[PDB]
Amino acid sequence: QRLKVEDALSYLDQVKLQFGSQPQVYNDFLDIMKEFKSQSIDTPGVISRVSQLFKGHPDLIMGFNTFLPPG
């Protein structure tokens, strides 16, 4: 069902704010996240991809880092 959404749309919103001219960036972030949740990739995979995704903005990087689930 998936209906538990409260602090999930917190970081995503920030990403959409800093990037509104390039819809390819946001769509790319969503795809990567879906791949990780699908057990398709590993932890270092999603972390590395997101890290390179936001090259120049350490804000979004640190945000996703502290947003990572308990491993």
Q: Which region holds residue 39: left if phi is over 0, alpha if psi is between -120 and 50, else beta? A: left
Count of the separate structural domains present in the chain: 1
CATH number, domain of 52, equals 1.20.1160.11
> What's the rounded Cα separation, in Å, for the pair 11 and 41?
21
Residue 42: DSSP 8-state: -
Cite the beta strand spans of 1-71 per DSSP E.
none
> What's the rounded Cα separation, in Å, for the pair 59 and 24?
19
> 2 lies in a domain?
no
> 1 lies in a domain?
no
Q: At what angle do helices 43-53 and 23-37 cross, to 10 degrees?
A: 170
Tell me the two tokens of residue 43.
């932890």
> 55 lies in a domain?
yes
Burial group, residue 43, by CB count within 10 angstroms (0-12, 13-18, 19+): exposed
Location of structure tokens 């640190």: 62
> 49 lies in a domain?
yes
Method: NMR
Per the structure, the complete domain to which residue 63 belongs is given by 7-69
> 62 lies in a domain?
yes
* Residue 61 near residue 50 (C-beta atoms within 8 A): yes
